[PDB]
């Protein structure tokens with residue numbers, strides 16, 4: 001129940017590479033980047049990618065995490081998701097822990 005995208009809202013051509021070059025040439029993408037490959041390392045942990053997630057109440061991520069399973073519930077509610085997504089809730093949120101809302 002989500003958009004089938006591997007990109008965010010402003011990815012570089014380096015992200016459009018193959019393999020993804022952001023892990024070689026640096027990352028410069030947006031907070032919506034659904035690319036588990038470039039933003040990894042400085043955002044996640046080996047406990048998050050376990051699928052669904054092994055973090056839960058025992059997280060070991062960085063901060064650039066886009067998962068709402070281990071990240072704490074946003075204060076988004078009643079139109080309080082100013083990033084522009086407008087999820088207004090952690091369950092609807094698909095942003096990261098350092099986004100505009102959070």
Ligand SMILES: [Cd+2]
Nearest residue numbers: 011015029033
């Ligand atoms: Cd990207």
Ligand SMILES: [Cd+2]
Nearest residue numbers: 015020035038
């Ligand atoms: Cd990428």
Ligand SMILES: [Cd+2]
Nearest residue numbers: 022027029038
């Ligand atoms: Cd990137």
Ligand SMILES: [Cd+2]
Nearest residue numbers: 044048061065
């Ligand atoms: Cd994570």
Ligand SMILES: [Cd+2]
Nearest residue numbers: 048053067070
């Ligand atoms: Cd997680």
Ligand SMILES: [Cd+2]
Nearest residue numbers: 055059061070
């Ligand atoms: Cd985590």
Ligand SMILES: [Cd+2]
Nearest residue numbers: 074076093101
């Ligand atoms: Cd949020």
Ligand SMILES: [Cd+2]
Nearest residue numbers: 085087093095
């Ligand atoms: Cd959101």
Ligand SMILES: [Cd+2]
Nearest residue numbers: 083095099101
């Ligand atoms: Cd957001």
